């Protein structure tokens, strides 16, 4: 079912998960439920345009894990 | 087939697919369907300057199945 | 241990390694010790937006080693 | 052999093989047969500033080849 | 020994090797001898920010030899 998760709801979840200032740029990037998961590495690192720090945690425990 | 699209062809193709805002990368890279056909996955995520979410979605779903 | 460490922390380490300029970018992209344990070769040399010969450096001397 | 081209060989070559726009980036970055035979993949996508799809003709027929 | 080069050093180096212009990246960067032993492809080709015919010879016949 995450799968079928809107712009908006991959932004709630990076919300709540502890980065609002990083959730916009998926909704920037227009990051869905099925393109979340689709996302690798880099795409998380260079392709949001969000700080390293965030983004390496994002990545590890939010993202990597799908 | 798409060995035989123009530009034009191609752009037909990921506006019909549901994506016509990213079909004018297509366009501005002149990517006609012999050059599709030769697309990888960062060609698609860093050479078109196209919003993130649909990039994934237009590589995994529409130019890996060609 | 490093992984424990603040941004404040990631901050000072650096500095008193020999890169006070540098030392800035940790700041900026945000690098706790989680971060910071983490990192690969690219998100030094290209994530921090600091210069090239002083990032080799804390990569292979201070960061790979973690 | 294309190993041991001037810059203006190089010019000439693409620019008789259909890339006439193009080849002005081989002048640009100054590439000479020894260069020519030492790109590889990214280097002619990521490195020339030229469309996207008229590079993966470039790399995929003449250059990879070589 | 070139473990010890200053940024000079390098300078001097590349300048007389035959890449008088690319030698100012090295100074940009701040590549002394102990970075340049720590360069990888992807550090000269896009990492100095120099032209890709003069960037391929450096990276082929001075910097991956070491």
Same mark, same amino acid.
């Given at each position: 079912?995450?799968?079928?998760?809107?712009?908006?709801?991959?932004?709630?979840?990076?919300?709540?998960?502890?980065?609002?200032?990083?959730?916009? +740029?998926?909704?920037?990037? %227009?990051?869905?439920? &099925?393109? #979340?998961?689709?996302?690798?590495?880099?795409?998380?690192?260079?392709?949001?345009?969000?700080?390293?720090?965030? +983004?390496?945690?994002?990545? %590890?425990?939010?993202? &990597?894990? #799908?």
């Amino acid at each position: 079912s995450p799968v079928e998760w809107t712009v908006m709801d991959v932004v709630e979840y990076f919300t709540e998960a502890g980065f609002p200032e990083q959730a916009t +740029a998926f909704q920037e990037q %227009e990051i869905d439920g &099925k393109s #979340l998961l689709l996302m690798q590495r880099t795409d998380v690192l260079t392709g949001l345009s969000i700080r390293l720090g965030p +983004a390496l945690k994002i990545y %590890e425990h939010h993202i &990597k894990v #799908l």
